[PDB]
């Protein structure tokens with residue numbers, strides 16, 4: 001498999017960015033398996049990669 005981004009290289013933060021959050025993101029796969037970053041991932045999160053899904 002191709003290597004995943006670290007919580008560094010995805011730009012993870014300890015608080016969400018307004019309305020942009022992991023627990024509402026198109027990438028997250030509940031309960032916790034984001035396709036953008038290494039596992040686990042918090043309910044709040046946000047990453048430095050954009051998505052067109054609000």
Ligand code: SF4
Pocket residue numbers: 010020021022023025026027028034035036037041045046047048049
């Ligand atoms: S780290 Fe980013 S891509 Fe992954 S679930 Fe969170 S907001 Fe989505």
